[PDB]
Amino acid sequence: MIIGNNLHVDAFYDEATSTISYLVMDRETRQCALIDSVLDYDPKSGRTCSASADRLVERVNELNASVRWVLETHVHADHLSAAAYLKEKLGGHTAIGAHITQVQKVFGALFNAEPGFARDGSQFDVLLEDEEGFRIGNLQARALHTPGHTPACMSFMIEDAGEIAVFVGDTLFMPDYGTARCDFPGADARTLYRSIRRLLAFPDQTRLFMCHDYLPGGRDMQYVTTVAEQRASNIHIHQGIDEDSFVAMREARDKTLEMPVLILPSVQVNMRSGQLPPPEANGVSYLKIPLNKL
Amino acid sequence: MIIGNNLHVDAFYDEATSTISYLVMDRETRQCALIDSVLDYDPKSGRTCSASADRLVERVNELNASVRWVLETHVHADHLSAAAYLKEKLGGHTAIGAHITQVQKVFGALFNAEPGFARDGSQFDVLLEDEEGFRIGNLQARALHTPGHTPACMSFMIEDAGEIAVFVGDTLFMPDYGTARCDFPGADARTLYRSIRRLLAFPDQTRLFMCHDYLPGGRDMQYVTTVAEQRASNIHIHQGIDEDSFVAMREARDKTLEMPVLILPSVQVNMRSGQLPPPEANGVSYLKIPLNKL
Numbered sequence: 001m002i003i004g005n006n007l008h009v010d011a012f013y014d015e016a017t018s019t020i021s022y023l024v025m026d027r028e029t030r031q032c033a034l035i036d037s038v039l040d041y042d043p044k045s046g047r048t049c050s051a052s053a054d055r056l057v058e059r060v061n062e063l064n065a066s067v068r069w070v071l072e073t074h075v076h077a078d079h080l081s082a083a084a085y086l087k088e089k090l091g092g093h094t095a096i097g098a099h100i101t102q103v104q105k106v107f108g109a110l111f112n113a114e115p116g117f118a119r120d121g122s123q124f125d126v127l128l129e130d131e132e133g134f135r136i137g138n139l140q141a142r143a144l145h146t147p148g149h150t151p152a153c154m155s156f157m158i159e160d161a162g163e164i165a166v167f168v169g170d171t172l173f174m175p176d177y178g179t180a181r182c183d184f185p186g187a188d189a190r191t192l193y194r195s196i197r198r199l200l201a202f203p204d205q206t207r208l209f210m211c212h213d214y215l216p217g218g219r220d221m222q223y224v225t226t227v228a229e230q231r232a233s234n235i236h237i238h239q240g241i242d243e244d245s246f247v248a249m250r251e252a253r254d255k256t257l258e259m260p261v262l263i264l265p266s267v268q269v270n271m272r273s274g275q276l277p278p279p280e281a282n283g284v285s286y287l288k289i290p291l292n293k294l
Numbered sequence: 295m296i297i298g299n300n301l302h303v304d305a306f307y308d309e310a311t312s313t314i315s316y317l318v319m320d321r322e323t324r325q326c327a328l329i330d331s332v333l334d335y336d337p338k339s340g341r342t343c344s345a346s347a348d349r350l351v352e353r354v355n356e357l358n359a360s361v362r363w364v365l366e367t368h369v370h371a372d373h374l375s376a377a378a379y380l381k382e383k384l385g386g387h388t389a390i391g392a393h394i395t396q397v398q399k400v401f402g403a404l405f406n407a408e409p410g411f412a413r414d415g416s417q418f419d420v421l422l423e424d425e426e427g428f429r430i431g432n433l434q435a436r437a438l439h440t441p442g443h444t445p446a447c448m449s450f451m452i453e454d455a456g457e458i459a460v461f462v463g464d465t466l467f468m469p470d471y472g473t474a475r476c477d478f479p480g481a482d483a484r485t486l487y488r489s490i491r492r493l494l495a496f497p498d499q500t501r502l503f504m505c506h507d508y509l510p511g512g513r514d515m516q517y518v519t520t521v522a523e524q525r526a527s528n529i530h531i532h533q534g535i536d537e538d539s540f541v542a543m544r545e546a547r548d549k550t551l552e553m554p555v556l557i558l559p560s561v562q563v564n565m566r567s568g569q570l571p572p573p574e575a576n577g578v579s580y581l582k583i584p585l586n587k588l
């Protein structure tokens with residue numbers, strides 16, 4: 001897609017985790033950003049693979065690009081982040097919400113992390129705050145704090161000409177599927193409602209890019225929608241739904257949800273900015289799986 | 295099912311792992327043994343459950359029976375053993391093959407076991423040897439060393455009158471499915487062939503009890519067959535199959551197999567006689583998952 005004049009957006013879909021990754025480039029400077037990259041991982045054998053990550057490396061080189069930002073909307077609990085691998089091969093700066101510290105505090109205790117594990121977000125280059133601006137070449141971008149799914153959820157808006165594109169993360173899905181879950185630690189259905197209403201306050205022709213697409217059909221994969229479409233036909237939080245009705249709906253639905261397959265391996269890796277836990281005496285890195293907790 | 299006159303056998307099926315558990319009771323003395331019990335485990339949330347195990351508990355009380363043995367044919371790599379739970383609930387003695395020490399040495403290193411983990415099979419009450427006899431009430435049983443799937447695989451032979459019943463474990467499946475795999479560390483296809491031939495040297499009327507039934511197509515669960523049926527129609531190792539021809543078949547097939555879903559959490563638990571890893575300082579037990587080492 002090309003929004004406005006110089007906003008270039010490439011979408012990448014991982015069927016295994018239903019995760020949509022993004023390559024966002026300024027066409028004027030050929031300088032780009034990578035959002036929510038997927039690190040392939042098999043829970044059975046405990047083996048990683050940069051198969052999907054290399055799809056981004058090829059796309060960058062094909063466009064003669066230059067990575068400036070490696071972004072993450074939130075601490076993913078459904079897949080492993082490939083932010084560290086991409087920074088090691090394409091360079092740039094990693095960035096995540098400032099409230100990563102709250103997440104690191106909780107799961108730092110759940111996994112009984114080694115004393116060397118930082119709870120200040122030292123693993124991430126830049127800690128973004130609400131309404132904070134940052135530059136992708138000539139493209140003016142802003143980081144928006146939109147909690148609900150997690151306490152540290154951020155949304156990235158990028159402007160070119162008069163048109164706006166917002167990368168919302170795990171807040172809104174396609175209008176036919178609804179919204180994200182709020183059964184994770186720190187999550188809140190009432191907070192999510194407010195973050196979305198604030199998101200839908202944007203101009204109605206604002207393009208919204210999704211983090212997941214579970215395909216309610218039937219239909220193929222879709223990643224882009226508009227504010228006007230969401231306000232009119234979202235099955236969970238369209239314009240007719242007030243705060244109280246959403247919360248009762250959202251909370252009742254979360255109780256009927258199963259845990260993500262890779263939630264325990266994902267968080268302990270994504271809280272380290274995509275770094276594997278440090279090797280033990282035998283030089284082997286291990287993922288700690290808490291028993292009968294969570 | 296009743297073999298001979300005083301041999302009572304109850305089969306139990308776990309849909310998730312296709313595992314077949316057994317309750318073997320002596321009718322006269324009303325004493326019994328439990329073979330390959332399953333401890334329900336959810337890898338997504340790290341939650342254990344004794345729903346299947348309690349089905350064994352209430353079945354014993356229904357028969358007003360007494361548990362003397364809690365057996366395991368080998369260290370399972372597809373499910374968690376519920377031997378410890380059943381021993382704390384029903385009593386008795388746990389027993390396993392003497393070559394448990396070999397698999398505790400290898401996986402004791404793979405999972406980097408904490409200082410205190412015994413690699414001599416000390417966690418098990420009795421270490422069984424080849425052709426060693428033991429008693430379930432008045433029933434004379436005998437343990438046979440039948441490796442190939444694992445270096446410590448045992449088959450349990452029990453006599454009544456008259457007729458012979460053998461619990462082969464993971465060696466022979468139903469004749470329409472063939473044999474077990476030999477890609478697991480310590481396994482060998484040629485030696486498995488030899489173990490099976492020993493088993494098929496028994497009288498043709500001898501009943502064989504399987505450890506798994508993966509349902510080729512859809513024909514309901516089947517756990518019992520005969521030596522004559524296996525010798526005549528086993529798709530992998532019937533009478534007309536030479537040793538060299540089997541090894542080439544078996545080793546080629548194992549290269550086309552994925553790891554079991556629960557292979558990493560099961561082994562590190564089953565090598566502790568069904569006991570979970572000792573809690574850390576925060577009072578939480580953790581399963582170590584080795585990364586890129588399998």
Ligand SMILES: [Fe+3]
Pocket residue numbers: 075076077078149170
């Ligand atoms: Fe998420």
Ligand SMILES: [Fe+3]
Pocket residue numbers: 369370371372443464
């Ligand atoms: Fe097995």
